Amino acid sequence: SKKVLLVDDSAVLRKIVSFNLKKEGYEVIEAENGQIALEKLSEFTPDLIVLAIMMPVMDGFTVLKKLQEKEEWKRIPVIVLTAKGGEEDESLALSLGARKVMRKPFSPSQFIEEVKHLLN
Amino acid sequence: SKKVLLVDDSAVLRKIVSFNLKKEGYEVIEAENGQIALEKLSEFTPDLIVLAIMMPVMDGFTVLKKLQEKEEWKRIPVIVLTAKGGEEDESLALSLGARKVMRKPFSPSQFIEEVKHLLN
Amino acid sequence: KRIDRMKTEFIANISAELRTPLTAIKAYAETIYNSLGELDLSTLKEFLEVIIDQSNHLENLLNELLDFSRLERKSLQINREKVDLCDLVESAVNAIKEFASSHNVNVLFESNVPCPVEAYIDPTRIRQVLLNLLNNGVKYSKKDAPDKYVKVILDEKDGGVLIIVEDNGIGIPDHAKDRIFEQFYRVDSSLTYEVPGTGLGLAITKEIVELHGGRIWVESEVGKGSRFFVWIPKD
Amino acid sequence: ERLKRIDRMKTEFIANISAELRTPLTAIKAYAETIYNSLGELDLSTLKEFLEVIIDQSNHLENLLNELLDFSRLERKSLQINREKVDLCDLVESAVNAIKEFASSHNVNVLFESNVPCPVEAYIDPTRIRQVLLNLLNNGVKYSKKDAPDKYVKVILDEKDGGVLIIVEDNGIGIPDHAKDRIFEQFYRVDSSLTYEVPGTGLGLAITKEIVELHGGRIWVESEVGKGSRFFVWIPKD
Ligand SMILES: Nc1ncnc2c1ncn2[C@@H]1O[C@H](COP(=O)(O)OP(=O)(O)O)[C@@H](O)[C@H]1O
Ligand SMILES: Nc1ncnc2c1ncn2[C@@H]1O[C@H](COP(=O)(O)OP(=O)(O)O)[C@@H](O)[C@H]1O
Fold first, then answer.
1. Phi and psi at residue D42, in whole multiples of 5°?
2. CATH for B3-119, among 2.120.10.30, 3.40.50.2300, 3.30.457.10, 3.40.50.720?
3. Which of A66, B12, C74, D141 is most buried by its number of CB atoms within 10 A?
4. One GO molecular function term (chains A, B) (predicted)?
């Protein structure tokens, strides 16, 4: 099955996003902050990364930047799922290599379309 | 067969309170504002009135005042269910003859306990 | 005075406006949780949709606060395109239909020119100006009248497009007309006490209009109604 | 000029309300929609769990709206204080329990010591002192170290200067010197790389200081960056 790395500091949010991904048959690996996410890339390569921005220890803008700095990691597609609503926040994330930026509060069924579109 | 007059300008709010009162076997008559509520006291005497404060046409403070000014109306117990949080708001409502003031957001099961207590 | 008194009023008003959808959220959620044996399937679903729709309204109110902070920071940018305003207005009209029905307000649209009315604007942002005007038309509508309406009128004037939002609501006193576009300003009267709001909508709308190179003004008479005029250059 | 006295802080304040409320709202909406669209794929156990999240996230959002309300009430001077004879010891334990889930979600241990035998009666408003203690305990969680195996917040009760002295101590991020003078001001939040993700409005400590002063007491702080902080709350016995 496709494998998703889900990166967010809210356990309540990881729970509901994971529920919806596993409804589609995906496997899900969770990380509580950006540094934990990059640690788990040493034990696998996901088909997709779902990334928040405002996390302790390492934020999602630093994650996106480090993803481009390593040959292995640079082509994993990333959807950014964030409360940062600015046009400027979205632009910065896309310029850092995010494939799509989705705002919070989000619709779980629109989120899942975008996940499927990127996986296929 | 206990009869409750439910007075609030929010259809959404009336719907949920009504659902909870009907789970107990009470009947419910609804009014969209204070004036309509006083008009419906022409056709029946409720065993209880659940009353909001901030309504157009006639507010709940004016309702409570007019309820004391008529012999037939003054003994019907009133629970005030309101978003007005202040201690001064509550004191005013109690001074105007309300039996109990409950804040919003509210617990439906706590609200039903207080309803039951006033009815018995 | 300046803003300080209005700031404290503003803070209390955020509390009040958000507390209403939150009350529905919490009561409906707790009811489902404690009444699972006592709900039929139509009712369960309806109660879930209330939660969802009330979350949506709360979300709109948060987006107002955000957009305002973004304007006080000149970060809010605009991206113009060629939009059929007839389509944009009809979409806005549809978006508010349910809110208007809950207050018994009829929502009308007339174009004084033939449609389409292509014009060079940011469609998201003008949709947002129209929704603030249409919402106020509902919020400040008469309290008990059988013929309450908000009408959008489209025309082409002075180079640009003129958009009028007309209502037969409560209207606005003379002294207040100058100030309604000010951040945090709200008319306080026995005809507005129950109506939720922050005083931010028209300050936001004025800033968006001005960013497009246009202006907005008002004509009102108390007890009759109000007309909000929005002039934006065509390009 | 002190135009931004409040003005730059006000804009910031507005943006911070939006952010802090957006978090619970995202959960409410995601969980409600998921239930709605998944009635067929939810077992009863999960249905109930997802409903409890909606209810708990609503409750957090309600707490944050009550902060905005209470701050406006203290500005208008309508907030009143009603004293009673309360066992502070028991009041602290109750606060500590109220914050256990939130502390646990950040791996923060919450402790209580009394330097005096107990009960420790004092003539104070129970609701209002609860709210002081919750704001200090919340801040000890929120501003706790990012990655440490021994994070704590500790409430210490003593009887000093013909009053009660409540200390809330943590081993969190600490507060720099320039910031120390200003943390009790309405809207003030330390902005650093160690606080960027932490939600808040800058009203908690302004509220707490006002409640404390209505009781005829005072609140002050001691801190060192990288070590932690101690908040001191002195309230007269009667
Ligand atoms: N169509 C209208 N009729 C009457 N009064 C209006 C209308 N639209 C706006 N107002 C007045 O202008 C004030 C500012 O409106 P706005 O900035 O949208 O804020 P809010 O709607 O939150 O109070 C309102 O409080 C109200 O007094
Ligand atoms: N225990 C603490 N450790 C470190 N910083 C603190 C602590 N408590 C408060 N602060 C700082 O004081 C500021 C003001 O706190 P408060 O008024 O509670 O508002 P908020 O918590 O919403 O920012 C916080 O933003 C933070 O910088």
1. -110, 130
2. 3.40.50.2300
3. D141
4. phosphorelay response regulator activity
